[PDB]
Write a protein that binds this DNA or RNA. Structure first.
Lengths: 120, 111, 178, 64
RNA sequence: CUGGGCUACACACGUGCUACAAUGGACAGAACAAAGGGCAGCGAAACCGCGAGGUUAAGCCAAUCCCACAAAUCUGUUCUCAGUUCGGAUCGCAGUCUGCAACUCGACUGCGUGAAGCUGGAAUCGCUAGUAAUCGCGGAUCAGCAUGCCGCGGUGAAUACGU
RNA sequence: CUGGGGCGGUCGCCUCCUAAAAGGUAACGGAGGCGCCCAAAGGUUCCCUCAGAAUGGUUGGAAAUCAUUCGCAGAGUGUAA
RNA sequence: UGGUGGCGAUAGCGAAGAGGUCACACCCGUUCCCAUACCGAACACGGAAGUUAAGCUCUUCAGCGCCGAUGGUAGUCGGGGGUUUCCCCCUGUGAGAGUAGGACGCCGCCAA
């Protein structure tokens, strides 16, 4: 009877009001987080091209944790994907907050990217 | 409250405490309360943890608030629906139980 | 957890066997209860809205929220602000001690309590319940305020139709007027 | 749950004049209660309690 | 001749009753009268019914017997200032008695209920001592029907400066 | 200023219409308002979405509040288009 | 099959089935990090018992909303005529509605 908003449903109404603030690229592709219930991802995307430049996720058979879906050991992907684009060298990227709060352990993904090098 | 009646006395006389509820009065409170044996006794609020429940059994076996209002509902409402010679003065406004209509009239009409 | 262990052991499969659903989790429940004062001091001239705080927190220790008037009224008091009535929209496990204080404890402290509300459902599953007395709830002190208000309590179900919800509440065991 | 706003809830011991007891939780360590569902006439089946409704109606008046 | 009405009822009055209360209210015990009626009548005692009264029945044609026990008052418990343990209507259920029959329309009793009233405006009244005021009793009508009417006794005041 | 003048009314600022699909574009033509207000009714971060309607309820009322659906906007957006 | 994009609702409302190991989900708890004008509904956190129910995907429908013509007309530039508050031709443009019809999506990138 009580109709609820899904945590994916209204989240992309909070995500697009970040998408009206940033340009995707500027030799600096945008970088979003996807916080599911089980395991949490990271892609490096840029408008105009829509090219996912380099990516990985917590779902990765290489470099498992193996606690898999908990605190900042699951932000090794925040450490990995910044090290993954480090061989592309690109860049001091733009960071999407998705539709989540930049709070930790969503912040801790992008925390792991900065001492992995990338300036944001 | 109380442990015996609904909205019972508290720190008051035992016969008047039995004279609280709409149906429990002075004569019957002295009668069935006299069967329980209080007489005020203890005159404020202390009858018993097992004596006040004795007013729950001896005090609980009789009635009646909703049964008094229901018997009145079947009387002014019973004769108010089954006739009558008690209905036209039961709600008509004039003296029903006997009086002068130019009288004091402090039951129904007044001034 | 005495109501909470009641339906988590028997009641939810009892509706499944009464009439079917797929997915045994698909069963209506207790969702949320919104207690209301609605008072507004009648009419703002008390001035104690906040008298309704002390009267409400001992139904359950949930901190309440005074409901602010969201409209200006031409026939009474007042324009917006100056809130009208308190509110606890309680949930969870404190939910399942509020109702154990209702059925076998405080709902018979309604004086002429027999059974009630044949039609007070909102048509599609909510259960409305008006309350006219306040010696009802147990941790209310008779030594305290001694002033008379009224309440609503709005029990919310999960069922699409109140068909399924009314039969749920009878498996809960709710005394209705029949 | 805000700290210091919500009163502590020790395990309650509900009781009654009929000796019925119930284990719940409350601010008070013990809670005597005048009436329980196991004692109230409505919840307890259809006890005569005091009525004996309809005795007598609408008529039964005869004496010889 | 039957039934009804004289008893109705938005309202204003007239005369009285009972109250608003601690000099009071409830109980227990004790004490004090006078007067009149009673045969188509009074009714003793006894038992029954909380109760009002019922039953039978001695006695009295009455300075003998009955109505009859007076009540305010005195001695203890207690209520403690409040719409109440005050006061009492209204009204409900339940009984008695009277009658051809108590619904319009007799009273009394039980249980319950407990209005309004916390000494009443301008104004108005009666009162010179066994008086005011107050507490009870009997009787004419009358099968029943008194807070009226007519008598009877009990407690026992203040003031009259003066025109 | 003026359909002679006088009397009446207006003199300046913002919005609409007349305005002829850029933009202006007149009359004593048709409507409103403006000589302020907000120390926040400003800036930013981060949330959320209305009005009305129905259904049922506490003195609850044609309507204050409270819950479930409707409801692209019939709500608000200081003050007026 | 999920995630992120780009394109005018031809992408949508609505009706109906089907899927869950993996993924997205609900779900479970609140000691933590952090939230409620209150509250683990949400927001945050760590976990895996239960689930296709809802979300979400696929598939059918054209009830609604949408797209959308051709022809023909209203209007109209430019001449020319009049019976001149308006009307008539000629040249060229051409609406709006309706309608024939389309459509309840394509095209990516990454991840399994």
């Amino acid at each position: 009877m009580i109709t609820k908003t899904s945590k994916n449903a209204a989240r992309l109404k909070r995500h697009a009001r970040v998408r009206a603030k940033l340009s995707g690229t500027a030799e600096r592709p945008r970088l979003n987080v996807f916080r599911s219930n089980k395991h949490i991802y990271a892609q490096i995307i840029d408008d105009v091209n829509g090219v996912t430049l380099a990516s990985a996720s917590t779902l990765d058979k290489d470099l498992n944790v193996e606690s898999t879906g908990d605190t900042s050991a699951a932000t090794k992907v925040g450490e990995l994907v910044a090290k993954r684009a480090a061989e592309k060298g690109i860049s001091d990227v733009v960071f999407d907050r998705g539709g989540y709060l930049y709070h930790g352990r969503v912040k801790a993904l992008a925390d792991a990217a900065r001492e992995a090098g990338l300036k944001f | 409250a109380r442990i015996a009646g609904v909205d019972i006395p508290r720190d008051k006389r035992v016969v008047i405490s039995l004279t609280y509820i709409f149906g429990i009065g002075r004569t019957t409170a002295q009668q069935v309360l006299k069967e329980a044996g209080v007489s005020e006794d203890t005159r404020v609020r202390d009858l018993t943890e097992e004596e006040l429940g004795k007013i729950r059994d001896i005090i609980d076996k009789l009635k009646v608030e909703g049964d008094l209002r229901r018997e009145v509902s079947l009387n002014i409402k019973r004769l108010i629906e089954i006739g009558s010679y008690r209905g036209i003065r039961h709600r008509r406004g004039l003296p029903v139980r006997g009086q002068n209509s130019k009288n004091n009239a402090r039951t129904r009409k007044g001034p | 957890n005495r109501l909470k262990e009641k339906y988590n052991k028997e009641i939810a499969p009892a509706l499944m066997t009464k009439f079917n659903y797929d997915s045994v989790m698909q069963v209506p429940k207790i969702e949320k209860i919104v207690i209301n004062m609605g008072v507004g001091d009648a009419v703002q001239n008390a001035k104690a809205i906040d008298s309704a705080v002390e009267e409400l927190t001992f139904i359950a220790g949930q901190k309440p929220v005074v409901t602010r008037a969201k409209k200006s009224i031409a026939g009474f008091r007042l324009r917006e602000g100056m809130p009208i009535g308190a509110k606890v929209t309680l949930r969870g496990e404190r939910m399942y001690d509020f109702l154990d204080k209702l059925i076998s404890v405080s709902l018979p402290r309604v004086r002429d309590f027999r059974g009630v509300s044949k039609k007070s459902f909102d048509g599609r599953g909510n259960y409305t319940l008006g309350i006219k007395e306040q010696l009802i709830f147990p941790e209310i002190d008779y030594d305290k305020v001694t002033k008379v208000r009224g309440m609503d309590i709005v029990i919310v179900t999960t069922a699409n139709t109140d068909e399924e919800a009314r039969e749920l509440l009878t498996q809960v065991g709710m005394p209705f007027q029949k | 749950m805000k700290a210091g706003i919500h009163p502590n809830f020790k395990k309650a011991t509900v009781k009654c004049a009929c000796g019925n007891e119930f284990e719940t939780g409350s601010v008070k360590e013990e809670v005597r209660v005048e009436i329980c569902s196991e004692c109230h006439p409505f919840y307890t089946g259809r006890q005569k309690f005091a009525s004996a409704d309809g005795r007598v109606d609408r008529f039964n008046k005869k004496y010889g």
